[PDB]
Design an enzyme around this catalytic site. Structure first.
Site, PDB file in Angstrom:
ATOM      1  N   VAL B  21       0.860  -1.174   0.000  1.00 49.72           N
ATOM      2  CA  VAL B  21       0.000   0.000   0.000  1.00 49.72           C
ATOM      3  C   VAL B  21       0.904   1.234   0.000  1.00 49.72           C
ATOM      4  O   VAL B  21       1.859   1.289   0.767  1.00 49.72           O
ATOM      5  CB  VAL B  21      -0.969  -0.006   1.219  1.00 49.72           C
ATOM      6  CG1 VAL B  21      -1.905   1.202   1.195  1.00 49.72           C
ATOM      7  CG2 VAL B  21      -1.777  -1.301   1.281  1.00 49.72           C
ATOM      8  N   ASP B 117     -12.163  -8.563  10.460  1.00 51.40           N
ATOM      9  CA  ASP B 117     -10.907  -8.238  11.130  1.00 51.40           C
ATOM     10  C   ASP B 117     -10.925  -6.902  11.896  1.00 51.40           C
ATOM     11  O   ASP B 117     -10.038  -6.078  11.717  1.00 51.40           O
ATOM     12  CB  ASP B 117      -9.722  -8.311  10.146  1.00 51.40           C
ATOM     13  CG  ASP B 117      -8.400  -8.698  10.797  1.00 51.40           C
ATOM     14  OD1 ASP B 117      -8.409  -9.073  12.003  1.00 51.40           O
ATOM     15  OD2 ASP B 117      -7.351  -8.588  10.118  1.00 51.40           O
TER      16      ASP B 117
HETATM   17  C1  LIG Z   1       5.258   5.301  11.100  1.00 52.52           C
HETATM   18  N1  LIG Z   1       4.100   5.452  10.205  1.00 52.52           N
HETATM   19  C2  LIG Z   1       4.230   4.615   8.980  1.00 52.52           C
HETATM   20  C3  LIG Z   1       3.046   4.877   8.028  1.00 52.52           C
HETATM   21  C4  LIG Z   1       1.717   4.625   8.773  1.00 52.52           C
HETATM   22  C5  LIG Z   1       0.519   4.908   7.892  1.00 52.52           C
HETATM   23  C6  LIG Z   1      -0.211   3.844   7.381  1.00 52.52           C
HETATM   24  C7  LIG Z   1      -1.331   4.100   6.604  1.00 52.52           C
HETATM   25  C8  LIG Z   1      -1.719   5.417   6.340  1.00 52.52           C
HETATM   26  N2  LIG Z   1      -2.851   5.757   5.582  1.00 52.52           N
HETATM   27  C9  LIG Z   1      -3.782   4.942   4.956  1.00 52.52           C
HETATM   28  N3  LIG Z   1      -4.822   5.569   4.395  1.00 52.52           N
HETATM   29  C10 LIG Z   1      -5.796   4.910   3.788  1.00 52.52           C
HETATM   30  C11 LIG Z   1      -5.689   3.513   3.664  1.00 52.52           C
HETATM   31  C12 LIG Z   1      -6.669   2.758   2.991  1.00 52.52           C
HETATM   32  C13 LIG Z   1      -6.513   1.411   2.905  1.00 52.52           C
HETATM   33  C14 LIG Z   1      -5.391   0.764   3.470  1.00 52.52           C
HETATM   34  C15 LIG Z   1      -5.290  -0.713   3.351  1.00 52.52           C
HETATM   35  C16 LIG Z   1      -6.173  -1.542   2.631  1.00 52.52           C
HETATM   36  N4  LIG Z   1      -5.782  -2.785   2.771  1.00 52.52           N
HETATM   37  N5  LIG Z   1      -4.630  -2.790   3.571  1.00 52.52           N
HETATM   38  C17 LIG Z   1      -3.867  -3.984   3.957  1.00 52.52           C
HETATM   39  C18 LIG Z   1      -4.341  -1.521   3.919  1.00 52.52           C
HETATM   40  C19 LIG Z   1      -4.414   1.477   4.149  1.00 52.52           C
HETATM   41  C20 LIG Z   1      -4.550   2.868   4.253  1.00 52.52           C
HETATM   42  N6  LIG Z   1      -3.634   3.634   4.875  1.00 52.52           N
HETATM   43  C21 LIG Z   1      -0.976   6.475   6.867  1.00 52.52           C
HETATM   44  C22 LIG Z   1       0.123   6.220   7.657  1.00 52.52           C
HETATM   45  C23 LIG Z   1       1.612   5.454  10.072  1.00 52.52           C
HETATM   46  C24 LIG Z   1       2.848   5.227  10.961  1.00 52.52           C
END
Ligand SMILES: CN1CCC(c2ccc(Nc3ncc4ccc(-c5cnn(C)c5)cc4n3)cc2)CC1
Ligand SMILES: CN1CCC(c2ccc(Nc3ncc4ccc(-c5cnn(C)c5)cc4n3)cc2)CC1
EC number: 2.7.11.1
Lengths: 285, 265
Positions: B21, B117
């Site tokens: 992602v 989940d």
């Molecule tokens: C240290 N950091 C590292 C980076 C970390 C982070 C992680 C994610 C985000 N945003 C974000 N937005 C929207 C999303 C929509 C869907 C998904 C999805 C669908 N399937 N699967 C497995 C993940 C994931 C999504 N993720 C921002 C930040 C924070 C902490």
């Protein structure tokens, strides 16, 4: 009484017979007498409970039946459990049919009756075989039919917990289905019906179709249970045996004891002589 | 669509995976999105589930053996990502998270869907303090063997599991304890032992550890969501009338406070 000795002090390993995620199975020889046994090497994990192992090994020892591979004791040495069993000189029906070709209807009838006797015994002890197939049906040099008595320890349990995922957020009814996994005793009856087609045709039905496609069709409302390919080659009793064992709904699938009264496995003339003929064909086509 | 997402978006940073992602930006406007790099029936149902508490679907691309699912970007990541820096959430913050998750779950359950989940790691927070719920994984599932000798009821469990809609309600009750204590109940116990204990008769559903710290409404919310029998476990719509999630003052401002703590603890 799980012996805390190294089996390699009593037995010479002669041949790797098979194996998988669980460990390995060997043909072994007594260093003093020369008797042949099969030794199943199971990799233990540090987290595995010894109580569960002693419970399973005690019940395995008292689970005596002529159609179940005989238990001769077990060894526990250096994170490895070795289960000593009777050696079946001809190997599995898959090993045999890969040389002999398809079995006759009478040979399959005898194999099915012997497997059903073994399954009636396991199911009476509240056990499920879970893996009935040609590869898991053993034949000894006497033409006799055996199932091995078994996954709830070591690497196979480690792998199953990896499929299930973290259980911390699971509702109890989700955890219960993740433990059971769809297996019920009547699943062995469906598997025997597939195995009967496997012995008759050298492959189970849909062998050439992608597994996901197979799984998908199986779970669709209106699935057609498989059938024998050549109608004229087989008696009405053999087609009916396949029909009732492959009953889609488990609530309607016959039990092993009920299947033992079916015309196909009740007929006279079913004896080990049929398999001695098969073994002769294995020696010289 | 059958275009390269590289023509419509500028890739910024990798967010996670296990496909992957990414965080990306609209080359023309400047909007931020999440691109999931991994069919006709799954995409149609995905497109159809549109609620404010569900991560928005912006379309999908199919290019060079890769499916890219374009979704709204939630700048703060998951509640697990947040609490690992901020520490445990207050009761009011958990009440607001639970209400928003229950709204999303009522929507999925009305569409005959199951989340399967619910956990801190799967609850996303945007920079506005809003709460959202969202190949190789299928190949791995098939690898766990041959299905040719399998009875149909074994094949059905190998492709569905023991999942029912009310399982998400139990999972939310566990997640509420997780946000309050930084771990779900029994986190230090081996998974097989957990599974085994769950399938016992005298099994006590978990509870919050420090009784005095939490109101009677929070203990009761945990009590009813963690009802052992699914036939007696309340639905998401019923849970939305519970006193913990019906109380006044539950708004995104509670999470903007949490996000401020994340910048400067
Ligand atoms: C240290 N950091 C590292 C980076 C970390 C982070 C992680 C994610 C985000 N945003 C974000 N937005 C929207 C999303 C929509 C869907 C998904 C999805 C669908 N399937 N699967 C497995 C993940 C994931 C999504 N993720 C921002 C930040 C924070 C902490
Ligand atoms: C080419 N060769 C390779 C070698 C082939 C063979 C294979 C097996 C045998 N005997 C034999 N006896 C007794 C046995 C008892 C138990 C098991 C058991 C329990 N679990 N699991 C998975 C296998 C397996 C047992 N196996 C002889 C020969 C023949 C064809």
């Amino acid at each position: 009484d799980i012996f805390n000795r190294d089996p390699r002090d009593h037995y010479d390993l002669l041949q790797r017979l098979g194996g998988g995620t669980y460990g390995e199975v060997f043909k072994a020889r007594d260093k003093v007498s020369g008797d042949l046994v099969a030794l199943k090497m199971v990799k233990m994990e540090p987290d595995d409970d010894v109580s569960t192992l002693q419970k399973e090994i005690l019940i395995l020892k008292t689970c005596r039946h002529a159609n179940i591979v005989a238990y001769h004791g077990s060894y526990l040495w250096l994170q490895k459990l070795w289960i000593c069993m009777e050696f079946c000189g001809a190997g599995s029906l898959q090993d045999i049919y890969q040389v002999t070709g398809s079995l006759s209807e009478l040979q399959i009838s005898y194999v099915c009756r012997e497997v059903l006797q073994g399954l009636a015994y396991l199911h009476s002890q509240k056990k499920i075989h879970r893996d009935i197939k040609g590869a898991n049906i053993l034949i000894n040099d006497a033409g006799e039919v055996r199932l091995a008595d078994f996954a709830q320890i070591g690497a196979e349990l480690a792998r199953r917990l990896e499929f299930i995922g973290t259980p911390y957020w699971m509702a109890p009814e989700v955890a219960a289905v993740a433990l059971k996994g769809g297996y019920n005793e009547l699943c062995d009856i469906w598997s025997l019906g597939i195995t009967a087609i496997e012995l008759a045709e050298l492959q189970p039905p849909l062998f050439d179709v992608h597994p996901l496609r197979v799984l998908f069709l199986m779970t669709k409302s209106g699935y057609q249970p498989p059938r024998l390919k050549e109608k004229g080659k087989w008696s009405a009793a053999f087609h009916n045996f396949i029909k009732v064992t492959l009953t889609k709904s488990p609530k309607k699938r016959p039990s092993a004891t009920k299947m033992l009264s079916h015309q196909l496995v009740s007929q006279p003339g079913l004896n080990r002589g049929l398999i001695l003929d098969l073994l002769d064909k294995l020696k010289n086509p």
